[PDB]
Amino acid sequence: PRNTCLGSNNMYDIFNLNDKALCFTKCRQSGSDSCNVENLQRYWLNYEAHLMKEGLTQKVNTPFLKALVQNLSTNTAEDFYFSLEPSQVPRQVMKDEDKPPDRVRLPKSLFRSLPGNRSVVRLAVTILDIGPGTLFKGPRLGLGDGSGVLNNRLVGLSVGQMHVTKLAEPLEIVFSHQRPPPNMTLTCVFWDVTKGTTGDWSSEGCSTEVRPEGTVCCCDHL
């Protein structure tokens, strides 16, 4: 039972995912036998890879991880919108639909930032729930009474299996929340795999606009 947290495994089966989802809460700030923090957050980081590897339009819907893999048509001449509603698996929004409070707009500029004249490219929009443990917190927020991933929730995007890409136009991600307390700002970030030891959150190339009913986050990288 203790062996599941220490070290990662290649298997990302519905059963296996759930087993590793334990660690999210199992791994308290306290030093423990059980948590290989960097191994586990590597595991989760490699999941969106594993989804990209299989060429399948698939939907996952566990109580922690909601994943959407699908294909995007090149030369669409339209910005792709998606519904990052935490309750439900992500779904592409149509032009005539009301825009969701939680959404991600991917500019048409994505194709130019990919090798060769693309016909169709694979997109993998995941929305993972981290929990209160040390996984995907890092040095910056591991501080007591300091800071935290809002809602212990985290939105995964990946297109065409490119680790680091610079985008012509920035992709915006809208997060819907009630105004946080005074003396408590809210800055958005991405998990830079190579920020510190074991990775950490970075605000590099991600401008944060505070809305009444959330925050908008334009990031010029994917």
Next chain:
Amino acid sequence: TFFALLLRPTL
């Protein structure tokens, strides 16, 4: 690429 909003106490 994981993405997230981050609460942080005002310095």
